[PDB]
Design a protein around this ligand. Structure first.
Ligand SMILES: COC(=O)Nc1sc(C)nc1-c1ccccc1
Ligand SMILES: COC(=O)Nc1sc(C)nc1-c1ccccc1
Lengths: 304, 304
């Protein structure tokens, strides 16, 4: 019993982190096979970041200008290329700790683990979600760029995020491992305002199922609703519309608990309209939306 | 910027987890040098757990009855002994992945990372605190016993917790790595009620400093207090008494922010008396008490 905000074990990713320095800029790189992936803004000064022309800045860089250090051992850079907003540094040594991996581009509402790193050295691991406005709410200081987000399926690491930017509002933006930003964000120090940070409704419902499984049941009520009626309330409270696809995804949790999805929606509707009245659910005083239905199943079944 | 409930990177501990089976009971063991540490209740049936005589049960066990598997490779058990509530299984092979380590016995209010494991296989990592009633609020299913709690100082793992028990109230009890339970708990399936789960005041104050550093400032007020006056309010709200030792420990955060500890206590007093009024601090609607002053400094400075 018990339900915690749980990250994936980070060892397989720790074995991939390196330091990348270009001139006076040091950040983190991801070493998989004989390629090191890092943000392309490693080539910028903070002055450059105001209005960078990355193709023009990169012309002034040679392989020997990219200093790549794995622990206290230097890697030899034998090529470099820019792909969207990432640099690929070809090294002469395959990472011996390369896990089975994939690059995936996640959808808003999906969760992942971040291995926060500085100078190629892991500092901490925590669980994130891709927000509906394509930001993440991370914990990133100067030097953390190139830290990555990932999911693990048994022995396969699916890398989905690389950290690039903090918005003036202190939320975070980054790319997939093909170097395409999530959302509209760019690797330029300019006005970038985030849109509405809506609540991920299917994730709140998953978490309420988690709560019932783990014995927190006070919020269950005598009511039901419909998707359309629920969605009128979701809209008012800046929750994402619930779709039949979401209802289908919650089927296993419905089955396990015997609480119909629309009955849990009626519980959530009352919690939105009435608040918590100073009560808590799984140790939270607000409705948690950074567990997916798959997260709740995995944690509630003990998947390794 | 940003402040997250962050666990230590878990790789150094992942490299130590093994499966231990005795008869029909499988749980996790910690392999350091040529010793495997596990809960002594590995020798019990669930029937046994009602009234176990561990010395008598252990007489019926031989080295060859303790099946220890590290990944898919079997370890040879060449001795066993009981130390308090843990078994030490002497194996013929030193763990090649043994990190620098220590065994530490933590104080209530101290935080640590848990690597939840099943059948010797890591499932997840999360951050815990030792509660003032010597329970922890974990996420542990059947098979998770022998999962461990730890802190990392650069390259040294300080192991402080091994999981043994879930109380009928769904909170968790365990031992240090010498096999001594935290608090009054025993490895018997019997009536064990936890005492008051008081709030760790010094940790709440650390977290309010974290909030100010990361730009959440609405709760700062025009007031101050004294330790004695604050403590009258702490008592009423089932907060731990704040001591001068705690004030001293918060000195660096006071210095960094320029907010005197007693001024932050007056902010906390008002939050206790007035509640949050539907507002949030670092994404929480309640006062978070599972970050220590050292955690806040570490996360706010990017220690690796
Ligand atoms: C467009 O630039 C390159 O292809 N540069 C070179 S030269 C070399 C010997 N390898 C690369 C290379 C290969 C894979 C990934 C990145 C770089
Ligand atoms: C009290 O029982 C033992 O000392 N048993 C044996 S016999 C052996 C060859 N080693 C041990 C041993 C050594 C260290 C840790 C646990 C066991």
């Amino acid at each position: 019993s018990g339900f915690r905000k749980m990250a994936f074990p980070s060892g397989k990713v720790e074995g991939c982190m390196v330091q990348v320095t270009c001139g006076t800029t040091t950040l983190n790189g991801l070493w998989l096979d004989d390629v090191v992936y890092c943000p392309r803004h490693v080539i910028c000064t903070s002055e450059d970041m105001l209005n960078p022309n990355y193709e023009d800045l990169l012309i002034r860089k040679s392989n020997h200008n990219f200093l790549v250090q794995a622990g206290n051992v230097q890697l030899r850079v034998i090529g470099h290329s820019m792909q969207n907003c990432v640099l690929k540094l070809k090294v002469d040594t395959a990472n011996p700790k390369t896990p089975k991996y994939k690059f995936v581009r996640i959808q808003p509402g999906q969760t992942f683990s971040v291995l926060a790193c500085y100078n190629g050295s892991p500092s901490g691991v925590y669980q994130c979600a891709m927000r509906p406005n394509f930001t993440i709410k991370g914990s990133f200081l100067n030097g953390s760029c190139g830290s990555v987000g990932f999911n693990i399926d048994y022995d396969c690491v699916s890398f989905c995020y690389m950290h690039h930017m903090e918005l003036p509002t202190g939320v975070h933006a980054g790319t997939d491992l093909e170097g395409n930003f999530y959302g509209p964000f760019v690797d330029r120090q300019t006005a970038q305002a985030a849109g509405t940070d809506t609540t991920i409704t299917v994730n709140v419902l998953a978490w309420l199922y988690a709560a019932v499984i783990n014995g927190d049941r006070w919020f269950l009520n005598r009511f039901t609703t419909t998707l359309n009626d629920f969605n009128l309330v979701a809209m008012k409270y800046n929750y994402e519309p619930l779709t039949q696809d979401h209802v289908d995804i919650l089927g296993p949790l419905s089955a396990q608990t015997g609480i119909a999805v629309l009955d849990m929606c009626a519980s959530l509707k009352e919690l939105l309209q009435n608040g918590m009245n100073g009560r808590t659910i799984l140790g939270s005083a607000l409705l948690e939306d950074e567990f997916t239905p798959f997260d709740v199943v995995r944690q509630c079944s003990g998947v390794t």
